[PDB]
Amino acid sequence: IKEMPQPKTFGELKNLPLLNTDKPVQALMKIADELGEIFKFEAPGRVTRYLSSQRLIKEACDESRFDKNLSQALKFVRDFAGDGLFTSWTHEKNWKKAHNILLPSFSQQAMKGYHAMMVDIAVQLVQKWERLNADEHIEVPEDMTRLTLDTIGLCGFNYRFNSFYRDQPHPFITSMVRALDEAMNKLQRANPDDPAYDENKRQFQEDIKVMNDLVDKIIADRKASGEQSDDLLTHMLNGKDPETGEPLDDENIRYQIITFLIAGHETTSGLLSFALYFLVKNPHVLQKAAEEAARVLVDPVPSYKQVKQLKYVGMVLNEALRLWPTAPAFSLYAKEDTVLGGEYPLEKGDELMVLIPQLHRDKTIWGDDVEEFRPERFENPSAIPQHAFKPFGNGQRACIGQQFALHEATLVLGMMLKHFDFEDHTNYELDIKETLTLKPEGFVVKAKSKKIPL
Amino acid sequence: IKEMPQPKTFGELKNLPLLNTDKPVQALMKIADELGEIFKFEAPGRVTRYLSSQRLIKEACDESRFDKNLSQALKFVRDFAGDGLFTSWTHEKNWKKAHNILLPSFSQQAMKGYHAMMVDIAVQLVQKWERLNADEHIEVPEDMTRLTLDTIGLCGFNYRFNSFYRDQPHPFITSMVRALDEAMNKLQRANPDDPAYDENKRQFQEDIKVMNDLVDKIIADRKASGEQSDDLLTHMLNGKDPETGEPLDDENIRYQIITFLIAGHETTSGLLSFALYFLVKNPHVLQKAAEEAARVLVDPVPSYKQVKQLKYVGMVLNEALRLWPTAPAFSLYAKEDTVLGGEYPLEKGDELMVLIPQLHRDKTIWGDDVEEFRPERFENPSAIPQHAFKPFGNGQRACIGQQFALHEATLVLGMMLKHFDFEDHTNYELDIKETLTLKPEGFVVKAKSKKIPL
Ligand SMILES: CCCCCCCCCCCCCCCC(=O)N[C@@H](CCO)C(=O)O
Ligand SMILES: CCCCCCCCCCCCCCCC(=O)N[C@@H](CCO)C(=O)O
């Protein structure tokens, strides 16, 4: 039985002021570097324990001992995402119902069905970059957000955000980013009902209204339609849970649309941005990935099977998720009194935070070179110990979109590597913007066309 | 020998305050309706005479008697267009030099060479409209400006404005519209050096700077690439005048690029916008034009020969130019003392304004039904009397871009009518915005895809 380390305190505010930063996850990573595999984090009225080692996280991921918790971040996101899949408790009827109804939308058959629509948006990205004039640059996270939002909109809902027709952000994206930024900024507030935050509350409610206006349109467009889609929205509106025999109700469907639009693009745009960052910073890796893209993508547009054959591109994406997992933490609660790691007694209800970027830097798992970008770590994924690589969370509450996101990202990165040479013309200094999720900010490159037609 | 009518005066300001309107051409048309084929227009320090009848305009179009004048509008535009083709005097060396160098850029061989690049931009417009969601509308003049600017940029200069990648105007367009608007607004100013206009002068100089920054880039991009292109810019940079044996100088080339970018898209965007307006207001005419497009455009993209075959679409465009010629006036001066129409003595140097929309409503030429949209007026072209139809001006100073504009507009309207049904869903009330040039403002439609693939 050991005493846990704890970072510096601020009297009655305990550790809460450590979150007074626009980069809280990066601040918690530096605390983990200083304190090691576990530290206690106290705020007025609550406590959590941040885990960073595979040794402890393998126990936290035991579903007999621990269940998904709503972190403070997810309790704030639930103000607009409700009992959608991401912000529901495992014990809420609508979690297992929606899980059973929507999992078929991510089957191999469903994925083959989304492929043509993913290609539609990927081709729009390639055409945009082919059409740039001499010495014009690419705003990477901006174009990756255009691609990923359009992809989940079209594949999921047969709705065109038409992000490549806009030089300004879509109103949905402005409102979504401001809602996530507010949830993050609320983490540091000792007194969230201080009238100082009344303007924040008004702006938050307006941003929720903008997101719900978009959901209204997606639903109306579908119920009107004389087409026959068989997509994610078809399953939301028509699917029956085999267990209860019930379909989703209208209120829950609205929460699922909001959930899948946000979760289904924010994280994937981050991944593609980080992957391109690591490729331009590691030219031998870029060359190996470009050689694979040239060898495999022999047709004007990629087939489903060709994307499955881009092994090295997949390894690049996994290595980007290792260093900068774009949903960088998840929360658990103890189902019963238990002892963690033979050293740390927990009571029923006690909360843990898994700090995924730190798990992914565990030298006992990955070796001393953890900061190096080396896709070859994923040559045989079976070599990775249980619960060592967790960019998609854990168990029955793991990411439903994992295969969707990796297919989209592999297709798009494959086409990018086939069609262009890339230049880090500014020698960009990585700057990671936090909105609960992680993404490079201000990342620009130049693309030189290889002049290969579509 | 007759005395000319004159509209209402404002004491020492004479007729100048009649131009204190954002719709001066439409105001002059209403004056012509009241006063007839000729009226005197006086301002402090000058006089011109507005002509509205074919009887008088056929004499004004005699190049032995009258030469092109710079109107006050063109003298203000010359502040940025210099001695480019539009704002040069016929007797300036650089007019005939540039005319001889650039005329071959509008040959049939040149037009066949521009066709593929016109199709590139037209396909971008069709894809934009195919990608709209249920019950979304089209902003017609906004999308026609996107198309026409992109077309002259790509065909003329191998430069991509990428207007379909923007929901906000290109900086060039904002600056160009504001410079034309300032030229129009300056027409009414009795005291242009009043300090009240100091902000107008600063903004005008800034807008000239933005336009010249774009010209810098177009030239640099070309001189860097080498040649490879054989387009309008190739002739500007390399062509020699067969008469003098001289190429254009650097200063004149810059003025020609500004001239062709402005003239080469503002007028054409207005034509396409008015043509679509008249088609949705005249459904029998829309059906005839749509039937021709379906019958002729049998391939995924139109050929040069197929566009030459769209006779009825061409008649629609000519009938839109009859009612709303988008460069709606041109100015002449008397080369010598002469008598106009046996009734109006003029002295050498005396100025005339041809009010083209009024010429085009001359009932003695067209019949009593001049306000009706009837493309069949153009079914037997030789039947149009000499100098009755002047949307491209007159003689050696006629529009150099006439064939380019009508090819672009016939291709684009043909593809629009092939791919979509149109609905005037707001029962739009025509509102004509003036910036020297004419274009509908606030014109919106709904397009229903015919689901014909590209
Ligand atoms: C609607 C679906 C999309 C939801 C957005 C995805 C969010 C994914 C990441 C959420 C965790 C971010 C970690 C924030 C840093 C942190 O450690 N927070 C703790 C602070 C201690 O209270 C907490 O929220 O308690
Ligand atoms: C650089 C290439 C683009 C040039 C801009 C195209 C301009 C087309 C001109 C259209 C006619 C403008 C008529 C304005 C109304 C008018 O009648 N103005 C008189 C007023 C009397 O002085 C004048 O300008 O004296």
Swiss-Prot record, chains A, B:
Which residues does the annotation list for site: Important for catalytic activity? T267
The UniProt record gives the binding positions of heme as C399
Q: Which residues bind (9Z)-hexadecenoate?
A: Y50
Describe the effect of A81W.
800-fold binding affinity for laurate as substrate. Low coupling of NADPH consumption to laurate formation. Very much more effective in indole hydroxylation. Favors omega-1 hydroxylation
Q: What is the effect of changing I400E?
A: Ineffective covalent modification of the heme macrocycle. 2-fold apparent limiting rate of flavin to heme electron transfer for arachidonate-bound enzyme
- What happens upon changing A329P? Enhanced activity with small non-natural substrates with altered product profiles compared to wild-type
User: Its induction, per UniProt?
Assistant: By pentobarbital. Expression is negatively regulated by repressor bm3R1 at the transcriptional level.
Indicate where this protein resides in the cell: Cytoplasm
Task: State the function annotated in the UniProt record.
Answer: Functions as a fatty acid monooxygenase. Catalyzes hydroxylation of fatty acids at omega-1, omega-2 and omega-3 positions. Shows activity toward medium and long-chain fatty acids, with optimum chain lengths of 12, 14 and 16 carbons (lauric, myristic, and palmitic acids). Able to metabolize some of these primary metabolites to secondary and tertiary products. Marginal activity towards short chain lengths of 8-10 carbons. Hydroxylates highly branched fatty acids, which play an essential role in membrane fluidity regulation.
| Similarity comment | In the N-terminal section; belongs to the cytochrome P450 family.
Task: Indicate what this protein is called per its UniProt record.
Answer: Bifunctional cytochrome P450/NADPH--P450 reductase
Can you name the source organism? Priestia megaterium (strain ATCC 14581 / DSM 32 / CCUG 1817 / JCM 2506 / NBRC 15308 / NCIMB 9376 / NCTC 10342 / NRRL B-14308 / VKM B-512 / Ford 19)
